[PDB]
Design a protein around this ligand. Sequence first.
Ligand SMILES: CSc1c(Br)cccc1CC(=O)N1CCC[C@H](C(N)=O)C1
Ligand SMILES: [Zn+2]
Length: 139
Amino acid sequence: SGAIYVGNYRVVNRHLATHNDWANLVWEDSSRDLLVSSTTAQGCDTIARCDCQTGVYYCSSRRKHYPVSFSKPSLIFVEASEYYPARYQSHLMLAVGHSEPGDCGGILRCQHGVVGIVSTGGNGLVGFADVRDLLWLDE
Ligand SMILES: CSc1c(Br)cccc1CC(=O)N1CCC[C@H](C(N)=O)C1
Ligand SMILES: [Zn+2]
């Protein structure tokens, strides 16, 4: 579990969105596993605007942060699950690192700010949904 709070927005994994998130929906994209809902309180997370390929992510299954090198956002095949049929997930970045299903929502950050959130994994890999292209998160 986990979310990004920037201004009046809350960014979460679309498969973990609550009733409240959907009743306050701003934008959602099944192909990216992202959903953004509005908030009353102010968010103070900074979103990175960069092309970094190194950063640090929070891994709840280990209560630890890990440094990673990750790939550029791209279309990657993701196996079927209780939330989605088998499909290509866009804007996804992979890294070699530990992740378990409950790790989704852990933040990936670089020196410039928040890069994305854990969205997929397995087999010694971790996948992050990128948010650096969502320029509207700051306006
Ligand atoms: C492959 S199970 C797993 C592992 Br292992 C580590 C980390 C995470 C998982 C769960 C997982 O990847 N998915 C279930 C939830 C929705 C995800 C998606 N984006 O389509 C797919
Ligand atoms: Zn960066």
